[PDB]
Amino acid sequence: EQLFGRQASLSNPRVSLVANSGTFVMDDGRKNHVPAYMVAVALGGLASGLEIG
Amino acid sequence: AVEPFPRRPITRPHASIEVDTSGIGGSAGSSEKVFCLIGQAEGGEPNTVYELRNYSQAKRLFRSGELLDAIELAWGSNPNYTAGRILAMRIEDAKPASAEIGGLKITSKIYGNVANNIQVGLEKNTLSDSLRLRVIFQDDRFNEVYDNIGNIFTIKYKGEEANATFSVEHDEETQKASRLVLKVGDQEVKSYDLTGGAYDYTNAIITDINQLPDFEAKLSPFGDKNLESSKLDKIENANIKDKAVYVKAVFGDLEKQTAYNGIVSFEQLNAETSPIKTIEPFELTKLKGGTNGEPPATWADKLDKFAHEGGYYIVPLSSKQSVHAEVASFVKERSDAGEPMRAIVGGGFNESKEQLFGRQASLSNPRVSLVANSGTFVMDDGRKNHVPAYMVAVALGGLASGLEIGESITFKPLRVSSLDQIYESIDLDELNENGIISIEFVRNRTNTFFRIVDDVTTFNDKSDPVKAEMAVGEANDFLVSELKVQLEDQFIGTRTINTSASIIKDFIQSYLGRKKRDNEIQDFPAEDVQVIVEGNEARISMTVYPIRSFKKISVSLVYKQQ
Numbered sequence: 195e196q197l198f199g200r201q202a203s204l205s206n207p208r209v210s211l212v213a214n215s216g217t218f219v220m221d222d223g224r225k226n227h228v229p230a231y232m233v234a235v236a237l238g239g240l241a242s243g244l245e246i247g
Numbered sequence: 248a249v250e251p252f253p254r255r256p257i258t259r260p261h262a263s264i265e266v267d268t269s270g271i272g273g274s275a276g277s278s279e280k281v282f283c284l285i286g287q288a289e290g291g292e293p294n295t296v297y298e299l300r301n302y303s304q305a306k307r308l309f310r311s312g313e314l315l316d317a318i319e320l321a322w323g324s325n326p327n328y329t330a331g332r333i334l335a336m337r338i339e340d341a342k343p344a345s346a347e348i349g350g351l352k353i354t355s356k357i358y359g360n361v362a363n364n365i366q367v368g369l370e371k372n373t374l375s376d377s378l379r380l381r382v383i384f385q386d387d388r389f390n391e392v393y394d395n396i397g398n399i400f401t402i403k404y405k406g407e408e409a410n411a412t413f414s415v416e417h418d419e420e421t422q423k424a425s426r427l428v429l430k431v432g433d434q435e436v437k438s439y440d441l442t443g444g445a446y447d448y449t450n451a452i453i454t455d456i457n458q459l460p461d462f463e464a465k466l467s468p469f470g471d472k473n474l475e476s477s478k479l480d481k482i483e484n485a486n487i488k489d490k491a492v493y494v495k496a497v498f499g500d501l502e503k504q505t506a507y508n509g510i511v512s513f514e515q516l517n518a519e520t521s522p523i524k525t526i527e528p529f530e531l532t533k534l535k536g537g538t539n540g541e542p543p544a545t546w547a548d549k550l551d552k553f554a555h556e557g558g559y560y561i562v563p564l565s566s567k568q569s570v571h572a573e574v575a576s577f578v579k580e581r582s583d584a585g586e587p588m589r590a591i592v593g594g595g596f597n598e599s600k601e602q603l604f605g606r607q608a609s610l611s612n613p614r615v616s617l618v619a620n621s622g623t624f625v626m627d628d629g630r631k632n633h634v635p636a637y638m639v640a641v642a643l644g645g646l647a648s649g650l651e652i653g654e655s656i657t658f659k660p661l662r663v664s665s666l667d668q669i670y671e672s673i674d675l676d677e678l679n680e681n682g683i684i685s686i687e688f689v690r691n692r693t694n695t696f697f698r699i700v701d702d703v704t705t706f707n708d709k710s711d712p713v714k715a716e717m718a719v720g721e722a723n724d725f726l727v728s729e730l731k732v733q734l735e736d737q738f739i740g741t742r743t744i745n746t747s748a749s750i751i752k753d754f755i756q757s758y759l760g761r762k763k764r765d766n767e768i769q770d771f772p773a774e775d776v777q778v779i780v781e782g783n784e785a786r787i788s789m790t791v792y793p794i795r796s797f798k799k800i801s802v803s804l805v806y807k808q809q
Contacts, residue, residue, distance in 0.1 A: 198468050201468060202465075202466065202468040205466075
């Protein structure tokens with residue numbers, strides 16, 4: 195519902211809203227539990243690597 | 248014709264797999280020609296012709312009936328000679344079912360007695376001052392629900408002034424409500440006529456109201472609502488300073504969403520110049536008045552519907568002699584008009600050969616062939632059905648549709664499980680000599696076949712193959728028709744500045760030579776062509792030898808010593 199609240203406030207094709215939050219295992223073996231905007235980086239880093247098509 | 252069903256909109260990318268007793272069934276194969284059928288069939292629009300490419304569409308639209316069984320025979324009779332595309336129209340003049348409750352006239356997209364099993368109802372959503380809808384079609388178990396119906400956006404006035412009022416006016420001449428005015432403290436800021444122009448959409452109004460420093464119009468997230476302004480509802484003096492003032496288009500929201508329902512159409516009840524009966528919640532109630540009607544005494548109007556459709560083969564699923572005459576007259580008309588066709592007919596169970604001769608005596612036409620045998624077929628789901636001849640006629644029609652133009656149905660096998668009567672050699676000869684097409688049984692060491700003995704039309708004379716053998720006549724038919732239409736395009740259709748008789752003669756000879764190079768025709772006389780031109784008209788005459796098939800072999804044996 196809060197996600198829909200953000201959707202209600204914001205509806206723009208130039209932006210996408212990610213909902214899930216999780217944890218990542220990183221260098222040195224440390225695993226960090228992080229908010230969604232860190233997941234957003236993973237989506238952004240992925241999309242950056244993918245080709246245009 | 249019309250390919251009725253477009254895509255279903257989808258929501259998510261996924262793969263789903265579900266066990267079932269039955270599959271998707273047959274499929275239309277590549278074909279030069281098209282196959283037309285008429286018969287008893289539940290579902291679909293009466294007096295409308297539908298094109299089918301797959302058995303799934305036939306199930307989805309022609310929900311049940313002997314017609315749907317006929318399609319299965321057409322594509323299931325032989326995988327090698329699978330029948331081509333299909334044109335179908337239901338004989339029964341079914342009716343829709345209707346419900347008129349709660350300010351709404353509700354009618355069924357489905358036509359027939361099934362339509363009365365549709366239930367639709369509205370409910371009041373106390374949580375958001377909105378109406379709610381549910382649609383259930385119990386036979387197909389199709390359940391649909393809509394919520395927050397009608398409410399688009401909310402307005403709040405934020406200033407300290409005593410009173411803010413929201414008003415919408417009504418036009419009685421057309422029953423529309425096309426004004427929306429915001430007033431605060433007996434002073435007006437703006438007024439939006441909802442009759443197009445400046446504020447055609449509610450989107451602009453929301454933008455307009457939001458610009459006002461003392462107001463905010465906020466979009467409801469429950470369902471896309473960008474309706475045109477004219478669809479807003481009658482509203483009279485709503486206090487904008489309060490917690491929430493709703494802007495409503497009850498029918499407009501219903502009109503958009505309900506268009507996507509697969510079962511129902513909605514109309515807004517006019518009272519019985521009468522004002523609008525208010526759309527209000529009501530119990531989920533059955534639709535009523537949907538029936539199958541009765542078939543017409545004459546099928547001529549139905550057959551006239553197929554003119555200019557290109558279906559070479561047409562089969563009526565009936566045994567009535569008068570109906571057969573109607574088709575024969577209709578086919579005769581189309582052939583002269585420039586649309587050649589062939590009709591396949593067969594009536595009743597185990598009908599007497601004398602009665603077959605009675606039909607032959609009444610009817611002798613090269614454009615039609617009469618099938619005598621009746622039998623039973625094993626079909627999908629393991630059910631085996633014992634059926635009249637006109638269902639066998641479909642198998643012949645479906646077979647002939649799959650075969651190439653130059654190849655006859657003669658002697659080809661058939662999958663029919665069994666036949667009512669097993670004609671003897673003499674019995675078969677009498678039928679074939681009298682222009683009756685029949686089925687023959689043979690047995691291998693451990694195999695059994697049902698074969699089509701030969702191609703013969705009701706026309707009896709053996710003198711002219713084109714009259715007798717439909718395969719030969721069909722080859723001539725497609726040859727001429729394909730030639731003329733091409734010729735029309737080059738000279739009549741396309742802008743031609745000049746033309747001579749000899750030029751036409753060369754073009755004709757070029758066309759025929761190409762056919763021989765494709766093996767479509769075996770031989771012909773090159774010098775026999777004639778061309779005459781007379782003002783705006785030209786006469787063309789030519790001859791081509793029909794193909795001859797292999798019929799008789801006689802053998803004798805001699806035993807000897809050593």
